[PDB]
Design a protein around this ligand. Sequence first.
Ligand SMILES: OC[C@H]1O[C@@H]2O[C@H]3[C@H](O)[C@@H](O)[C@@H](O[C@H]4[C@H](O)[C@@H](O)[C@@H](O[C@H]5[C@H](O)[C@@H](O)[C@@H](O[C@H]6[C@H](O)[C@@H](O)[C@@H](O[C@H]7[C@H](O)[C@@H](O)[C@@H](O[C@H]1[C@H](O)[C@H]2O)O[C@@H]7CO)O[C@@H]6CO)O[C@@H]5CO)O[C@@H]4CO)O[C@@H]3CO
Ligand code: CA
Ligand code: CA
Ligand code: CA
Ligand code: CA
Length: 632
Amino acid sequence: SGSEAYFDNSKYGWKDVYVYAYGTKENAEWPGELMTKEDSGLYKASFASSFKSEKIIFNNGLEKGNGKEQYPEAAGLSLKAGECKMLTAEKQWIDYGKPDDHAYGYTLTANNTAFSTESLDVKLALKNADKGYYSVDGSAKKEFANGDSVKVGEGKIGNSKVTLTLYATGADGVETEQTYTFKKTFTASKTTFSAKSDGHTTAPESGYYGTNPEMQLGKHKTISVDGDLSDWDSSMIIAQGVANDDPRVYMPSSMHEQPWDAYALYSAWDDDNLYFLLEMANTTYITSPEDNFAASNEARPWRNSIPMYLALSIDPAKQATGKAVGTNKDGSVYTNPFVWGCTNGTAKDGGTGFTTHIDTLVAFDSNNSNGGASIFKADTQDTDGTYMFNYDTRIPIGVTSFQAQDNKNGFKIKYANGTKSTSIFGINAPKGSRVMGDNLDMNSNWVDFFDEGYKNSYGYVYEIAVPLNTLGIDRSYIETQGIGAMQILTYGTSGMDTLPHDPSMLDQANLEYSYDPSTSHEKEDIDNITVPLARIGALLPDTEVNEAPFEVNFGANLNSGQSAGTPITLLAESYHATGDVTYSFTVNGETVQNSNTDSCVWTPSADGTYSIGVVAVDANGNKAESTKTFVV
Ligand SMILES: OC[C@H]1O[C@@H]2O[C@H]3[C@H](O)[C@@H](O)[C@@H](O[C@H]4[C@H](O)[C@@H](O)[C@@H](O[C@H]5[C@H](O)[C@@H](O)[C@@H](O[C@H]6[C@H](O)[C@@H](O)[C@@H](O[C@H]7[C@H](O)[C@@H](O)[C@@H](O[C@H]1[C@H](O)[C@H]2O)O[C@@H]7CO)O[C@@H]6CO)O[C@@H]5CO)O[C@@H]4CO)O[C@@H]3CO
Ligand SMILES: [Ca+2]
Ligand SMILES: [Ca+2]
Ligand SMILES: [Ca+2]
Ligand SMILES: [Ca+2]
């Protein structure tokens, strides 16, 4: 009954090992309880059935200043009733069979680990036995002993999962099995670009993120601002974000808070308006449905009035820091650090400044009830040569009554539940377990939430029209010089998420909010934008484009290690190809007949170590090849 935690002390070398457990119950005040050294060398602790969901911290029991050591430093390792886990010498937190007396095979790499190498050398081990067997992707069972290796992913096409089952029998005669899953990832090169003249100092975020993906700069089209999405399509996305990267996810337990999760920004223009579609996600339904408010439409962004901004760069030469200027009735000049801040019932610090060049802020609000919504122009130079947003010349775009939704000067905004994208990509790691930078690691636990129960109605959309005559531009300007744009989401003051995504949205995500340390300091800190804006209409003139080359993702549908006579499907995928792609599959250099398809079925006759390959050629003669190992 209960749960068990084991600790490998062979590297830490602590005289006494303590374990501190918190969550459903606290085992004891820090430093916790003494673990028991076993003759295996491992240290062991047990927790009763009452300790249903715990976070575990190991430590040497010593005080600050007298040699205190602990691991992890903040967020404990997850352990639930019914589990038996071990912290290895390499500091992997792994399943170690189950909390009973049976034998089990286990891996020294944590279950559900993703990897981008061609294989992952996963070491195998046995608990309460000394021989086991393994089956990988349905292979015949093959014996193994402690220390042996399995090349997980060997031979396989990228973006496939690998199943690995370990079999053992203990002294009690009970045959057990432990099934593991690993993901071999593949990431195609993406065409990306930037220009020095915009003052940006951080490269556009990539991976799942993208600024002007596939060189999409928006489209010339008339949009109907009405909350219906049939007038948009995926080709019009100028900034691709990800789901579940809003700051709350980096706190130990902040999934109860309303998300501010930007997903994608689309743009179009005609001769009258500049148009935008903003998609926001709410994955709480899937990640933490126990948090009733956040996993419900009580989380809709128009529940309360929260500032939202479209930062635009019309004149590319101007740099506006965010500072604002105005005049008093007596002619005296004043400045504020941001156009809106500690303003009318927001009594919190925070804002978003700009290094990347902008000169215009469309300052609006999430339920379109702020009669002060305005287009601010950075039309006044400060002493340092930067420009300040001018209260005196702002263009009012606010409603006269919330009920009426009658925005001034032709500004149009509609919001609704809905989702335009048919994929919602983000990280689905357990709550509390997120780490800094993990949104840029392709081996984090990325999912398409539509494969995990997401529904269109979970998300939120805003459709917006900004009249060109409020921006000092026309369609010719957009199509010939272009402009830049970024959407900013707040939770009142400071930024929380942006499109394009900027790392200042997360640089302090794991720090405590002044008024409530359960939630994120990102709600109140000072952010500063350093990535490129998304271009609309045309690239900046000094843009350097980094073109992704033609490339192939190739391999088997089954892990290396299959039995003779098993049909193995060799698959090939192409990226950045021109025209038709022809694929030539080979095994030890000998061709396999594939028709003119992207797949071939190879049935190995005899044992051996085969070199499987593909050569791909497109209609402009670009060539890509891949060669992999497959063992029978
Ligand atoms: O207690 C478990 C803790 O023990 C060890 O931490 C030392 C620590 O090094 C000392 O500084 C001191 O802690 C002081 C704090 O310095 C002081 O600020 C205050 O702490 C309060 C917090 O300020 C307040 O936010 C709240 O804390 C929450 C917290 O926000 C949650 O995230 C959660 O904290 C967990 C930690 O994340 C986790 O690492 C672990 O902490 C260990 C720590 O690793 C170790 O070095 O467990 C906690 C869960 O208990 O929950 C807490 C509480 O809800 O409340 C605390 C009030 O305690 O006071 C503490 C005195 O404890 O002393 C501890 C040794 O106890
Ligand atoms: Ca529409
Ligand atoms: Ca997001
Ligand atoms: Ca920040
Ligand atoms: Ca912030």
